[PDB]
Amino acid sequence: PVLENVQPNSAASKAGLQAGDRIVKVDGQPLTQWVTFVMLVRDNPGKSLALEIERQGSPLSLTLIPESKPGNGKAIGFVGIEPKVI
Numbered sequence: 001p002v003l004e005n006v007q008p009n010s011a012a013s014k015a016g017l018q019a020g021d022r023i024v025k026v027d028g029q030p031l032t033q034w035v036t037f038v039m040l041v042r043d044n045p046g047k048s049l050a051l052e053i054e055r056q057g058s059p060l061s062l063t064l065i066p067e068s069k070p071g072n073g074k075a076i077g078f079v080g081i082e083p084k085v086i
Contacts, residue, residue: 001034002084010080015064017081018055025052034083041066045077 001023006012023031026040027050040049045068053060066077 001031001037003081004084005082007080007082010078011065011067012079012081015051015062015079016060017051017053017062017064020055022054023051024054024059026050028052041077041079041081043077045075047077 003012003017003019003021003023005019006017023037025031026037031037041064045066047065049064049066051062051064053062064079066079068075069078
């Protein structure tokens with residue numbers, strides 16, 4: 001759960017996230033599946049998510065508040081994160 005990149009002017013940028021950050025915990029829970037993070041974002045626009053990350057081996061606590069996009073019939077949360085390349 002290593003971010004490939006963070007878009008400027010995004011919720012993730014506001015949270016202080018950067019390319020290369022590893023998401024370790026979400027709301028005090030270990031992040032063991034990338035899809036959990038994706039779902040937390042999509043389903044919780046406007047909610048404050050407490051992140052524990054590792055950045056160059058060191059721990060940081062950050063606050064992420066997904067922004068919204070219209071979706072298609074139901075607005076979704078959106079953070080501006082490019083997932084790791086596959």
